[PDB]
């Protein structure tokens, strides 16, 4: 539902990262993992703004604020979640090179 | 050329940086934006309520409402005595019927907290009998007007036909002002306040008004200390 | 194919939306700017008068007994020496106050940044609850009002008809348009702390008895212009 | 006009996605599918806002702002739809790699 | 120049697209054209912000709207033009694969 | 805390850059250094504002606004820091190609 | 300070572009030139906004935001410069593909 949209975005990117790390050995899923994780954060940024402005009125800003702030939250939380988990995949890439 | 993946995230951060900035600006100006809306709702709400209650009584009383939240009373010599502050029985019966319904609108949930002052204003024509001095035609007119204005206020709270409860009287003390005006603020033939190139009247400029002042100055003021408190809160 | 060039379009979309929200913020400023200007216009004129009153009267409050109370008012304490004993007649002592204070007081009011920012100069005469004679609550309230109205009006009578206070033609007509002699009563008392009663404190019966010169700012007209400009514009599209 | 463009854009992206998934076997059409789906949604978001920009009146800011946001809010649904369907294509590509 | 930049941005991308289609048989110039048509759109978005804010005045924001609206018009018209023509080349790449 | 979170993010990026330049010879860790340095700066920019948006609601405006602006004023210093050191790594790779 | 670093950011990008075209034949510097040129422009844009953000506060938004926009007006000239010179390198690559 609408209010539980920021957690759905974080939960889905977290779930895909868990799927991305259970393989950890294909090396073709891992090369596509940072792009897919970042794309989903962009996806939740697009749909987050879409639901933020779906009930946005320039006159009644106060009544349009709870949905707009929620859309900003799911945009920032998923972008942070997507970049953080894409960075973990990148960090794990070095650890394979060192040893 | 995989640098575009990182660049798209930088522009995404730049995108929502200005989205929050636009939102933050929108939030912080809501108090300022609401002030014209509060003024519009209260003034038109009071005017509509004043029109609804009294439009059937303007012609009999001689009163006029001109969207200024005031009940202007024309046709002197029946409201007060000729050159005296004594209240005539004609205006006494007018105040009995008018004020009870007038105070009901004033002491209402949407208006009791949006009213700062209710002004009883006694206006007198610029000419005073037996005098030919402009300076002396303004003060003895103010002496009469102040007593006439106070006479109406005295009659309202010291009557036997107005159902003024023991608690409503304190509200009049803290809001009702008996402001006795003088030859100043005249009215032209159209009922509009005088301009630099217009004349005045005598039977229309002599009037008694019941003007309502909304507390929008306080609401504007309360933003100032809130902004000052917010500014002082960061130090 | 091998290289995904949709990240270039994603960067293009993000950059374009970055300035679209920048545009929206700029447009929102124009949409609501007169409303935003009202609090700052009030803020600058109230402190401007407050600073000007302080800049002009700090050295003279001790002699007069007056105090500026951050409400654009000059509250003159210690009555019964400014007015006659139970009468509106002005004592000599308050006259030299009126000759000195008002001439340099009207200059601030009749100044370029303040002449068009003022609706009303309220001369207010307040009286303690305890009347000199009867102890009634309703008839003594209006007995104070009759006295206070005359005391306030007598101040207004001498404030521009005095020979020493030489008011010009362009200055007197500003007084009949912007000055009000309002005679208050027990309805506005002052507690021992020096502020209006809020929790039901005890009136000092001496701080309440006062004469004030309050300034009203035309901030209600500025809000009315915003309402009027919207109503006229709304009616234009009909 | 702006709302119809957004609905046509969203409907178009779904139509190409159905065409993209009914083949699912070219192995070269599917490789270009994420790029085309996202680019098409980005194109319709660009056009929807641009059409809303030319109708904006700089003189009448008070009434143009609600109209501009009305077409803006529906434009984000095209970009979100394109990224969503392209994510499914890349998710399906990951599922193939797990086999 | 200033108010002709939106048409110049659109016209430049159409000219490059016409150059790309007359070099269609190379197949090496292709697959780089979509990334360059969009990049030129990105260039004109940055130009739009640069020319939309060059005459911005903090004291007078009311008079800066027409200049800032010029930049948003340049940014959105050129970016849409670059994305649209990149779509056409991408679509034509599908036709080669399917034929 | 958000000031320290941004300072930690800026301080961490300088720490990885030092590790990335003390090696300077692997040529496989070095090619992945600019992406990770930028990604780390992107993450700290996102999480710096995302943390400040956790308690920022419609009712907690007078309370959570001071901590939201602290994140805004310091989030982009980490993103610039990561790109600055990533640019040095890329520039240092150019100087190797000239020899 | 933001205005002064705009010329330095623009002036630096022209200097690196000149170094990129002095070689013009390595084929390994030239492939990384557009990425570094664009990244450098984005870096200076981010610093220009980061510098302008430290003076932004919510105490008085009716003049801080107009001050913020008046300070970051020159931040996007480096971004436009970076993409423009990167386009020239990319265009020159196409010109060498026609032979």
Author numbering:
A (entry chain D), D (entry chain C), E (entry chain F), F (entry chain E), G (entry chain G): 1 to 99
B (entry chain B): 13 to 247
C (entry chain A): 10 to 247
Authors' description from the paper:
Using cryo-EM structural analyses, we show that the Zorya type I and II core components, ZorA and ZorB, assemble in a 5:2 complex that is similar to inner-membrane ion-driven, rotary motors that power flagellar rotation, type 9 secretion, gliding and the Ton nutrient uptake systems. The ZorAB complex has an elongated cytoplasmic tail assembled by bundling the C-termini of the five ZorA subunits. We conclude that Zorya systems, on their own, mediate protection by recruiting nuclease complexes that can damage host DNA in vivo, leading to population-wide immunity.
ANA-3 and ZorA II-ZorB II from Sulfuricurvum kujiense DSM 16994 yielded protein samples that allowed structure determination by cryoEM at global resolutions of 2.2 and 2.8 Å, respectively. The structures reveal that both complexes consist of five copies of ZorA packed around two copies of the ZorB N-terminal helices, as seen in other 5:2 ion-driven motor complexes. The type I and II complexes largely differ in the degree of elaboration of ZorA and the length of the ZorB N-terminal helix, with the type I complex substantially larger than the type II. Unexpectedly, the C-terminal, presumed peptidoglycan-binding domains of the ZorB components, are ordered at the top of the N-terminal helices with the domains dimerized. Similar domains are present at the C-terminus of MotB, but structures of the MotAB complex have not resolved these domains, and they are considered to be mobile with respect to the intramembrane complex in the inactive motor state. As for all other such complex structures solved to date, both complexes are presumed to be in an inactive state since they show no open path for ion flow from the periplasmic to the cytoplasmic face. For the ZorAB type II complex further processing yielded a low-resolution volume that accounts for the predicted first helical domain of the rod (residues 110–140; 11% of total rod residues) and allows docking of AlphaFold models for this region to the high-resolution complexes. The volumes support modeling of this region as a 5-helix bundle and suggest that it emerges at an angle to the vertical axis of the complex.
